[PDB]
């Protein structure tokens, strides 16, 4: 289609005394999980997590298994290095994380690339939007920025995201055999005072990118909306709600607006018995 993405999520969690770290990679095309590696098996393999990946040749799985084990090893070494860099005692449990990936528009060129790491759940180092320079999050990471600049690592990470990532994204999207439009309702709820909550629901939509906004008299709100982050419904679709507090009797001065890739035009709706 038009806007698409391929993203990988890497996590290692150490456990001194018990064994080597547990390392996991999870891949997503758009908002759908499609592959996974988990080092906590005897002979762990790169595996499909969707129907349209199950017919892919063995060589793809083998190659990505070896790349995943290499990443396991990198994460194991980085966890040790990070203990030194942050002057931490041994014996505790720690995490190392990486997220990378690409977004493309309709032309198949890279719109936006990502390459960033975290230690114990905190920013460590990230490739900037230019895919040319790094931002170190603290003094500890400043040495990594220096090493990676001297080695020219941004160029290689750049080349991956501009080439391999975007091209395999294109391949994955030809696999198998589409957008799910949201269905919206507005519910009304009582409160102690002479006011009422209007909750605007969007259900059954894919992909997850959506915009729910309320308006008063066709203009921007003065109050702040309450909302929940977009969330999986358990069948590969997503839901969201946004809400507003309004005077009892003035409900219909407020309108909910829903923007989604699937819709021909935005939905407009207001409370209605």
């Amino acid at each position: 289609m038009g806007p698409h993405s391929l993203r990988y999520f890497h996590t290692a969690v150490s456990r001194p005394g018990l064994g080597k770290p547990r390392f996991i990679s999870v891949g997503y095309v758009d908002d759908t999980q499609f592959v996974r590696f988990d080092s906590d098996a005897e002979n762990p393999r790169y595996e499909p997590r969707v129907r349209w990946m199950e017919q892919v040749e063995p060589e793809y799985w083998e190659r990505n298994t070896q790349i995943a084990k290499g990443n396991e090893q990198i994460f194991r070494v980085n966890l040790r290095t990070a203990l030194r860099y942050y002057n931490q005692s041994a014996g505790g449990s720690h995490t190392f994380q990486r997220m990378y990936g690409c977004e493309v528009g309709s032309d198949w060129r890279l719109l936006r690339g990502y390459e960033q790491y975290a230690y114990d759940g905190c920013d460590y180092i990230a490739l900037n939007e230019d895919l040319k320079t790094w931002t170190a999050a603290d003094m500890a990471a400043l040495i990594t920025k220096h090493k990676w600049e001297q080695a020219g690592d941004a160029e290689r990470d750049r080349a991956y995201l501009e080439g391999t990532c975007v091209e395999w994204l294109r391949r994955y999207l030809q696999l198998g055999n589409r957008t799910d439009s949201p269905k919206a309702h507005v519910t009304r709820h009582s409160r102690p005072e002479d006011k009422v909550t209007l909750r605007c629901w969007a259900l059954g939509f894919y992909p997850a990118d959506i915009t729910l906004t309320w308006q008063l008299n066709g203009e921007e709100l003065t109050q702040d909306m309450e909302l929940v982050e977009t969330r999986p419904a358990g069948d590969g679709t997503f839901q969201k709600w946004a809400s507003v507090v309004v005077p009892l009797g003035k409900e219909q001065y407020y309108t909910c607006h829903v923007y989604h890739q699937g819709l021909p035009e935005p939905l407009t709706l207001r409370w209605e018995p």
Partner: peptide, 8 residues
Amino acid sequence: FEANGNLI
């Protein structure tokens, strides 16, 4: 198709 990480 996955990329190699980097050593910090």
